[PDB]
């Protein structure tokens, strides 16, 4: 037993990570087959004019301006194109380690594994959830842009995030693998702020279900409530509304634990009104909302079926 | 910026994982060159009286009895022997994916990355700290035994832990790669309890530094204290006593923060008594003690040396 934030194994992703340098600017690229994808602001430099326009600056760059290295080997750029906020760098060598993959746009509330990288070299791995305000609470320094996030589904690496920038609040923003930002953000030197965030109600219920599976059940009561009355409570604590779709996604954890979803909502309603009473749940003094129902099941299993 | 529990990329380790099956028991193995390392209780059968004779089961078993799988490929065991609580299965093929590696005995307070496995097949990765009572707080199900914990140092993998079992309190126990258990535990079906766990004082300090580097400062104070003076307020509070060895270790964090360790100790003493008064530090409502100083440094940029 035991429950912990757990990243997907990063081996498949590590073999696609490369360093991209244009001028004195370096960041990370993702090498699949004969293409390297990377944030377009690799072409930005110090001596650029204020609030540059990427159209104009890329026009100055030739193939020979982009220096891509996969370890101690130079990949030769043979073509470049810009697709929204990412650069597609056609190279003359196919990555022999390209996994089965898909490009995916995750929804808010969902999690993914982040392979933070520097200078083309993977550095560490951890879980993030896409916040309802379309930011993630990551750990990224300068040189980490191009790091990707991803999930594994059977044999297929689903890439869902490429990191670009940090916001003044200290939270992070990036694109899908087509260069489309999550949230109202731009890879520009313009003032931006994350909007107000909300708590991912469905995730907190999954976490409480995980808590029960692991024997942490002090917060259960005989009580139950309705979907309407729970949501009237949730709204007042900045929790996002709970939909029947959410209730159904919690099915397997309710089947597994024997605790009906609306039973769980009553315990949660109670922790929201009266607090955690100095108690910790799974070693946390706060309510965790970055564990999806899938992430719990992934870690406990369904033992009804023998 | 930002601060997160971060596992090492697990790629170099995933290529070492294999599946070991003796009779009806299946757990994971570690395939380094031409040796597979695994827990000895893979040979245990519940049909045993219980108190096992591991040595004579080695005589009882032949090489045929051990089924080693790298994916769907079988490795013929050509030798088998016991070293403390670990099996060393000699196979006919040397692991072509063997990395540069050491075998190390971690010290209580140090951290490592656990690659959680079932059936030779990686499931996920997360950080653990070896607790002062020689347990770890992981997420391990039945069949997770044989999973390893490791640290990457350049391109050399330091294997420091192999998981064997779970204690009735929900924490986990294991050996180094030489089969020697961390702590007074044995791999038998007998009543065992972990001693009293204590907070790793040096690590809470390192964490408080990570917050200051990252922006969380409210806890700081112009107040000061001394070493024995701080260790008074702490020993009664179940904390590891702080030593001059720990002070020095935090040197670089103080150097970057310009905050003296004793000054940090003072505001930490203040944090023990008062409590956090509904306030968080780096997204946490309790003091985190599983970030070592070096773990912090790896997630910070250091203005000093330019």
UniProtKB/Swiss-Prot annotation, chains A, B:
Which catalytic reaction applies to this protein? Answer: TSAVLQ-|-SGFRK-NH2 and SGVTFQ-|-GKFKK the two peptides corresponding to the two self-cleavage sites of the SARS 3C-like proteinase are the two most reactive peptide substrates. The enzyme exhibits a strong preference for substrates containing Gln at P1 position and Leu at P2 position
Q: Where is the signal peptide?
A: none
Protein activity control: Inhibited by pyridone-containing alpha-ketoamides compounds 13a and 13b. In turn, alpha-ketoamide 13b (tert-butyl (1-((S)-1-(((S)-4-(benzylamino)-3,4-dioxo-1-((S)-2-oxopyrrolidin-3-yl)butan-2-yl)amino)-3-cyclopropyl-1-oxopropan-2-yl)-2-oxo-1,2-dihydropyridin-3-yl)carbamate) inhibits SARS-CoV-2 replication in human lung cells. Inhibited ex vivo by michael acceptor inhibitor N3. Inhibited ex vivo by compound 11a and 11b.
The active site consists of: 41 (for 3cl-pro activity), 145 (nucleophile)
> In this entry, which stretches build a coiled coil?
none
Membrane side Cytoplasmic: which residues? 1-300
Peptidase C30 domain span: 1-300
| Domain of life where this protein originates | Viruses
The impact of changing residue 142 to A is: Does not affect ability to cleave and inactivate human TRMT1
Summarize the impact of residue 49 to A.
Does not affect ability to cleave and inactivate human TRMT1
For this chain, the site of the Glycyl lysine isopeptide (Lys-Gly) (interchain with G-Cter in ubiquitin) cross-link is 5, 90
Q: Where in the cell is it found?
A: Host cytoplasm; Host Golgi apparatus; Host nucleus
What does the UniProt entry list as the effect of changing residue 132 to H? In strain: Omicron/BA.1, Omicron/BA.2, Omicron/BA.2.12.1, Omicron/BA.2.75, Omicron/BA.4, Omicron/BA.5, Omicron/BQ.1.1, Omicron/XBB.1.5, Omicron/EG.5.1
Quaternary structure per UniProt?
Answer: 3CL-PRO exists as monomer and homodimer. Only the homodimer shows catalytic activity. Interacts with host FBXO22; this interaction promotes the proteasomal degradation of nsp5.
The task this protein performs is described as: Cleaves the C-terminus of replicase polyprotein at 11 sites. Recognizes substrates containing the core sequence [ILMVF]-Q-|-[SGACN]. Cleaves and inactivates human TRMT1, preventing tRNA guanine(26)-dimethylation of tRNAs. May cleave human NLRP1 in lung epithelial cells, thereby activating the NLRP1 inflammasome pathway. May cleave human GSDMD, triggering alternative GSDME-mediated epithelial cell death upon activation of the NLRP1 inflammasome, which may enhance the release interleukins 1B, 6, 16 and 18. Also able to bind an ADP-ribose-1''-phosphate (ADRP).
Designated name of the protein: 3C-like proteinase nsp5
Q: Lineage from the top down?
A: Viruses, Riboviria, Orthornavirae, Pisuviricota, Pisoniviricetes
Boundaries of the shown chain within the full protein: 3264 to 3563 of 7096
């Amino acid at each position: 037993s035991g429950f912990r934030k757990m990243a997907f194994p990063s081996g498949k992703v590590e073999g696609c990570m490369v360093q991209v340098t244009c001028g004195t600017t370096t960041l990370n690229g993702l090498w699949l087959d004969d293409v390297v994808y990377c944030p377009r602001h690799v072409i930005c430099t110090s001596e650029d004019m204020l609030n540059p326009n990427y159209e104009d600056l890329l026009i100055r760059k030739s193939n020979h301006n982009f220096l891509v290295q996969a370890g101690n080997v130079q990949l030769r750029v043979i073509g470049h194109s810009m697709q929204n906020c990412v650069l597609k760098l056609k190279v003359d060598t196919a990555n022999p380690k390209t996994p089965k993959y898909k490009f995916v746009r995750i929804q808010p509330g969902q999690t993914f594994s982040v392979l933070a990288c520097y200078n083309g070299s993977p550095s560490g791995v951890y879980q993030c959830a896409m916040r309802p305000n379309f930011t993630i609470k990551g750990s990224f320094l300068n040189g980490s842009a191009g790091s990707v996030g991803f999930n594994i589904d059977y044999d297929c690496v689903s890439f869902c995030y490429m990191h670009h920038m940090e916001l003044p609040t200290g939270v992070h923003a990036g694109t899908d693998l087509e260069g489309n930002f999550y949230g109202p953000f731009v890879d520009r030197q313009t003032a931006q702020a994350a909007g107000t965030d909300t708590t991912i109600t469905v995730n907190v219920l999954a976490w409480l279900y995980a808590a029960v599976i692991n024997g942490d059940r002090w917060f259960l009561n005989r009580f139950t409530t309705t979907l309407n009355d729970f949501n009237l409570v949730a709204m007042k604590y900045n929790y996002e509304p709970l939909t029947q779709d959410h209730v159904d996604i919690l099915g397997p954890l309710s089947a597994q634990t024997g605790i009906a979803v609306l039973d769980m909502c009553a315990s949660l309603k109670e922790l929201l009104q009266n607090g955690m009473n100095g108690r910790t749940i799974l070693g946390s003094a706060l309510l965790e909302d970055e564990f999806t129902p899938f992430d719990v099941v992934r870690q406990c299993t369904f033992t009804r079926l023998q």
